[PDB]
Amino acid sequence: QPKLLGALPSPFVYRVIWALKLKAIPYEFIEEDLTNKSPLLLKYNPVHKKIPVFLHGDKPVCESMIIVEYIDEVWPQNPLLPKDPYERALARFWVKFAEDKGTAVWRMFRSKGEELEKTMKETQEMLQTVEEHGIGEKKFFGGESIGIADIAFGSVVYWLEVIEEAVGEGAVFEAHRFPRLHAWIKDFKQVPVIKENLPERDWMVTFFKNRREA
Amino acid sequence: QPKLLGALPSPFVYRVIWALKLKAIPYEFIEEDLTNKSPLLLKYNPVHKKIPVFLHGDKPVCESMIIVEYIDEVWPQNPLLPKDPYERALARFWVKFAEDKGTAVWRMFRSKGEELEKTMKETQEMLQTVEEHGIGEKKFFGGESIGIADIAFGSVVYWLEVIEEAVGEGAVFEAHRFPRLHAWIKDFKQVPVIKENLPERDWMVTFFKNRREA
Numbered sequence A, B: 001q002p003k004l005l006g007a008l009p010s011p012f013v014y015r016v017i018w019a020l021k022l023k024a025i026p027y028e029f030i031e032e033d034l035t036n037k038s039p040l041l042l043k044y045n046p047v048h049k050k051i052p053v054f055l056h057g058d059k060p061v062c063e064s065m066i067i068v069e070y071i072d073e074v075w076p077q078n079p080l081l082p083k084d085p086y087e088r089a090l091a092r093f094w095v096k097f098a099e100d101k102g103t104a105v106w107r108m109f110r111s112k113g114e115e116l117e118k119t120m121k122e123t124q125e126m127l128q129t130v131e132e133h134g135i136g137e138k139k140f141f142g143g144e145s146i147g148i149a150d151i152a153f154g155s156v157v158y159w160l161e162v163i164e165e166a167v168g169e170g171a172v173f174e175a176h177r178f179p180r181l182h183a184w185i186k187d188f189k190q191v192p193v194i195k196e197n198l199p200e201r202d203w204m205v206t207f208f209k210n211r212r213e214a
């Protein structure tokens, strides 16, 4: 049975959890303490020593969207990728976008003064971009159903909502400024399997709140 | 006939050129001046407004390794990806690695003091990592033949060799310190189609040299 090494609040782990849950693939979750990384983690992710690590058979697969693509080839049911190659490239483009531009959300969490200033601005340009170019008339990035880009961005934007509250004056992701994006994240959290596997906002705010004060 | 928008010295364009050449796919190269970006570029890459842009039919495909994956699905001859899904994830892992860690090479080019200091150190840890974990006993990342990770890293490391000379005291990518990597880049440049489509080092050194002084 496949193994997922990770830890609860990680956006990168929930990407993998969602893909596993969406495909109703059975797995064992291996709780990892990063201040005390198990020998398993150090053996199977020697390059980055990060989680998630996905252990299928004895082979390890490491970066989270890499794992989602792996999971998707090996377990084709409930496709996270379109069949057309242009649509597939489009889906990958927005995953890549989420990974690169989404780093602003995570710098935000640790930023303070003018540094916090800039990442909030950068976070805002990311959203403006997606809001105008990213999500078409279709309900999800993936069409009528959740795709890899929904996974990738869904973790960026939901964690952003929470990181915002944890920082305080976060006038960043405002629903009336970015209505199409808020409609999309609202629908994404509304999907039964995402709904069932979605960390409760309040708990996370406090968690990242008490984490930021330190 | 497919269109490739780009400009000569760009590592990201040569990724696409190599994939096109390796598959003997015919295309038109559209020279782009980035200080004066054509309306075509602004229309088909509104999100980043960067090159390369690959125009197949009327559809644009934008980030360079995204384009290589597109080219590879649409033109399956001379496969750049393995058939096994684990090997495929492995190949993607090292592409992703090249893209993330390779940014050190490109910060180097613009760095000066302690800033240059750090990126040279970071560049060195990237190489140490690949040198020990990246390339197995097999000749290429892709096995007996060039794969996507060879493409991705091949552009990082060759441009690094050149950027090194352009900066001066670059004691970074030393052949005796990283012999397995030097064997690999040596073999990569030795491949007939890469050899034929490889910017001449001397010209590029000067180009990046005169570019750095400014």
Ligand SMILES: N[C@@H](CCC(=O)N[C@@H](CS)C(=O)NCC(=O)O)C(=O)O
Binding pocket: A010, A011, A012, A034, A049, A050, A051, A052, A062, A063, A064, A065
């Ligand atoms: N898989 C993620 C990276 C995941 C990641 O960065 N995880 C952190 C915590 S969420 C970690 O495991 N270790 C952080 C460290 O030790 O530097 C990706 O797509 O790049």
Ligand SMILES: N[C@@H](CCC(=O)N[C@@H](CS)C(=O)NCC(=O)O)C(=O)O
Binding pocket: B010, B011, B012, B034, B049, B050, B051, B052, B062, B063, B064, B065
């Ligand atoms: N496709 C590349 C990015 C290519 C890129 O950054 N190109 C630069 C020059 S090599 C550009 O077109 N524009 C730079 C700018 O205008 O900011 C990728 O894989 O991210």
